């Protein structure tokens, strides 16, 4: 008997689930990484064409398991009918943004593995621990974590010049709308994409604590208040070819130390690399070298 404790109470599984459905980001990759092809998982809403709806590392693993991708058409929100049609024995939502009502509705379909605290606030190691336990594979989950950690360490050790360059650099992950720079998003330390950076040797600036009290996974702040993040050595943001220059020319954002120094890592918007920034055991293997190279080049400019 599997007992799960999460934000909405307790989920009981009578035995290891035969059929596995997942929702939201990343969860399907934990299953796949453990050798399980989901009977259904959320269509990728970012990093790849909706026509395709599945990220390259996920696709690759599915093929390696001789399986096929069954996607829930749920770009606009949870598709309860589709989930129900997959006839699951468990629904992995260890990393997700489900509400009480969502949890109650899903639970009528099958036992739900929900997040521990607040929506979208599950780090990658915790994602594995929650999801792997719900699969009745807790031990395999621990092993998967150690193996993923070793993959990370291997890339860092293998490239000392990148490792030394980013080590101890104070970093913030942000989302900046090029069309409106009067405000932007900063991701909190409880967001997996912000926390992953610490696995790579970077650290959070002092100013991040100021967001410890934020209830959400990210906080939108005014450019008039951007001085707050002058303590970051390097800044990471989604964007494109024009992003850095537009930022450096911005009358308010251009004054920020890291931006002024050109210490900004621009992740190509809506690409696999962008999507990988919320890491999974599969995405890391696939993208870490590429990611480290972008991070290393940006940290080069930290003064
Ligand atoms: Cl190197």
Residue numbers in the entry: 39 to 341
Paper text:
To obtain sufficient iron, S. pneumoniae evolved two major highly conserved iron ABC transporters, which are termed Piu (for pneumococcal iron uptake) and Pia (for pneumococcal iron acquisition) systems, respectively. Pia system is responsible for the transport of hydroxamate siderophores such as ferrichrome and ferrioxamin B, whereas Piu system for the transport of heme from hemoglobin. The overall structure of PiaA is composed of an individual N-terminal and a C-terminal domain linked by an α-helix. The N- and C-terminal domains face each other to form a hydrophobic and plastic cleft.
In the complex structure, a molecule of ferrichrome is bound at the center of the inter-domain cleft, with the iron moiety sitting against the bottom of the cleft and the backbone pointing outwards. As shown in the electron density map of the complex structure, the inter-domain cleft captures a molecule of ferrichrome with Λ-cis configuration. The iron moiety of ferrichrome is pulled to the C-terminal domain via three hydrogen bonds with residues Arg231 and Tyr225. In addition, the backbone of ferrichrome is stabilized at the opening side of the inter-domain cleft via three hydrogen bonds with the side chains of Trp158 and Asn83. These six hydrogen bonds keep the ferrichrome to adopt an orientation with the iron moiety pointing inward to the binding cleft. In addition, the methylene carbon atoms of the hydroxyornithine moieties are further packed by a hydrophobic barrel. This barrel is mainly composed of four residues (Met213, Trp223, Tyr225 and Phe255) from the C-terminal domain and three residues (Trp63, Tyr84 and Trp158) from the N-terminal domain. Similar to most class III substrate-binding proteins with a relative rigid linker of α-helix, binding of ferrichrome does not trigger significant conformational changes. Upon ferrichrome binding, the Segments 1 and 2 missing in the apo-form structure undergo significant conformational changes. As a result of induced fit, residues corresponding to the two missing segments are folded into a loop and a η-helix, respectively.
